[PDB]
Write a protein that binds this ligand. Structure first.
Ligand code: DCT
Ligand code: MG
Ligand code: MN
Length: 539
DNA sequence: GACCACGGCGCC
DNA sequence: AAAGGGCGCCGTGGTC
């Protein structure tokens, strides 16, 4: 290009280089911004941030978070990554976008800046006429990048000392199981090694191999596999317990405390805006969208996430979100009436499994019905359902036949979605967010049908993601007026942090904002709870 | 040290 | 395991 003197002109496309991928832990190595025929490089990166008024370019949110870390108000402007992601959800990284639309993602701030300008021109040029994508960009994604920036920079408080002592506790319980797995095995080995375990269970012990692995075709030792052999030998019962514990200790209990930022005393996740194929968000380093909740030990980990002194956590989750979305998208008179009568499909389905009244269904029994109702909905097999519920295959198939018979309009939408998908080559959400499926007309029955399940799942899951995103955009400005913070987003759940005084008012406000974000043919009811910790905030 | 494929699994 | 979908992270085992 051409060397220009810092600062750059108003609205120059910025390019930056970090020491590591986490903006909260990264050192701003280099900083530059591209203008028409100029490069505008910076001498000192941290001082150069003071000159900028807006971050426009590739990964705009990342630099914004780093600036927001240094107490700087540097909002996220245009981001070509957002443009490419809307053009195609496949475009997830700058490395994949640049080579597709003329350019090369490098490690130079100036060349990264230059790319951001030219990539903008191509992508914004290809976004002409796509008013459904433009509306989804200007009114949702582009504002959301600002909200996510404040969320990542804020972070969530974690009870360090609690998890520390909890680690030593789980440790002794792991050694007990491990010692109780060795004796039955007759010898010691690596329980973490599925290879060594496979030999012990199937070659040494007389246990039957029930499943194979995908890539290598080895005898599987998965949970579902061991679940079937839970009475074939007592060692299997203990392995499942060992699996659960080491899983929680190696993923959450141990890593999370060492992820606390020294200057904030909080946990800072990354909300990837262009990572999923359905339009969902993504949480990484650390993943705060997969904090355990199912098991008792998992709930103990959940309580480690607490509010700041004098503050309270406020959790809001859309009740039966995709089922309501499905009711709006399909227009099933029976399904719409279900919610209009204030029914709970998860509760009734759990009432059928355990053979108990709807009132006898506890919060843990109902949750187990989610994977079944959602499973069956998106093409689960009667075989798989039979084994999970420990019921005969004849009883499992009867559920599916009865499940889709309660609502004789959903399948009309499913085939409609697939047919429209085979014609256009892509399925779209309620707002217009499209996903290109290239195997709807595949010749292989496996490849074709697998692409089909991805095809009609995208509009329902994607719509829910769209509604949540739009809700966050409408809700966030209201938070700053009441001194409230937006902490986490869990697909259909929002975790807020408000002062103890107005914590009640925030919950009532946030609930109403989320319920009326986009009125459908079905009411979008939201369950809200206030607690001193995350687990308490959902009870 | 940085990276990779794989099985496995936590959540939504 | 399998005809549920969407993620990220873990240890193992391995390469460079
Ligand atoms: N095993 C699962 C669980 C969830 N989901 C999707 C469906 C909706 C979305 C979030 O829904 P949840 O909050 O997990 O459950 P729900 O349907 O919203 O019901 P509730 O809010 O009462 O738990 O994630 C899924 O596809 N598969
Ligand atoms: Mg939820
Ligand atoms: Mn929900």
């Amino acid at each position: 290009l051409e060397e220009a003197p810092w600062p750059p002109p108003e609205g120059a496309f910025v390019g930056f280089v970090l020491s590591r991928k986490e903006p909260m832990w990264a050192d701003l190595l280099a900083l530059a911004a591209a203008r028409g025929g100029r490069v505008h490089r910076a001498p000192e990166p941290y001082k150069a941030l003071r000159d900028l008024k807006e971050a426009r370019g590739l990964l705009a949110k990342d630099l914004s978070v780093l600036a927001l870390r240094e107490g700087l108000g540097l909002p996220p402007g245009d981001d070509p990554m957002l443009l490419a992601y809307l053009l195609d959800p496949s475009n997830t990284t700058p490395e994949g976008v640049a080579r597709r639309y003329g350019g090369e993602w490098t490690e130079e701030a100036g060349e990264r800046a230059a790319l951001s300008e030219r990539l903008f021109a191509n992508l914004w040029g290809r976004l002409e006429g796509e008013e459904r994508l433009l509306w989804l960009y200007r009114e949702v994604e582009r504002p959301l990048s600002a909200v996510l920036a404040h969320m990542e920079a804020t972070g969530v408080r974690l009870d360090v000392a609690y998890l520390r002592a909890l680690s030593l506790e789980v440790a002794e319980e792991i050694a007990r199981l491990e010692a109780e797995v060795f004796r039955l095995a007759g010898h010691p080995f690596n329980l973490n090694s599925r290879d060594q375990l496979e030999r012990v269970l199937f070659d040494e012990l007389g246990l039957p191999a029930i499943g194979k692995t995908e890539k290598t075709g080895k005898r599987s030792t998965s949970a579902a596999v061991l679940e079937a052999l839970r009475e074939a030998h007592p060692i299997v019962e203990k392995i499942l317990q060992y699996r659960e514990l080491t899983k929680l200790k190696s993923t959450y209990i141990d890593p999370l405390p060492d992820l606390i930022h020294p200057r904030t005393g909080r946990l800072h996740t990354r909300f990837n805006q262009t990572a999923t194929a359905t339009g969902r968000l993504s949480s990484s380093d650390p993943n705060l969208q997969n904090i355990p909740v199912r098991t008792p030990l998992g709930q103990r980990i959940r309580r480690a996430f607490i509010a700041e002194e004098g503050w309270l956590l406020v959790a809001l989750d859309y009740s039966q979100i995709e089922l309501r979305v499905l009711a709006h998208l399909s227009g099933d008179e029976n399904l719409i009436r279900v919610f209009q009568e204030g029914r709970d499909i998860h509760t009734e389905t759990a009432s059928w499994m355990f053979g108990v009244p709807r009132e006898a269904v506890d919060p843990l029994m109902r949750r187990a019905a989610k994977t079944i109702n959602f499973g069956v909905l998106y093409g689960m097999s009667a075989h798989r359902l039979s084994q999970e519920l420990a019921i005969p295959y004849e009883e499992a198939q009867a559920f599916i036949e009865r499940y889709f018979q309660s609502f004789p309009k959903v399948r009309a939408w499913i085939e409609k979605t697939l047919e429209e998908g085979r014609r256009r080559g892509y399925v779209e959400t309620l707002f217009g967010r499209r996903r290109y499926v290239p195997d709807l007309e595949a010749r292989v029955k496996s490849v074709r049908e697998a692409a089909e399940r991805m095809a009609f799942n995208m509009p329902v899951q994607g719509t829910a993601a769209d509604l949540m995103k739009l809700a966050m955009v409408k809700l966030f400005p209201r938070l700053e007026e009441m001194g409230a913070r937006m902490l986490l987003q869990v697909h259909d759940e929002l975790v807020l942090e408000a002062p103890k005084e107005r914590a009640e008012a925030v919950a009532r406000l946030a609930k109403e904002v989320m319920e009326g974000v986009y009125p459908l043919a079905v009411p979008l009811e939201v369950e809200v709870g206030i607690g001193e910790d995350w687990l308490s905030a959902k009870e």
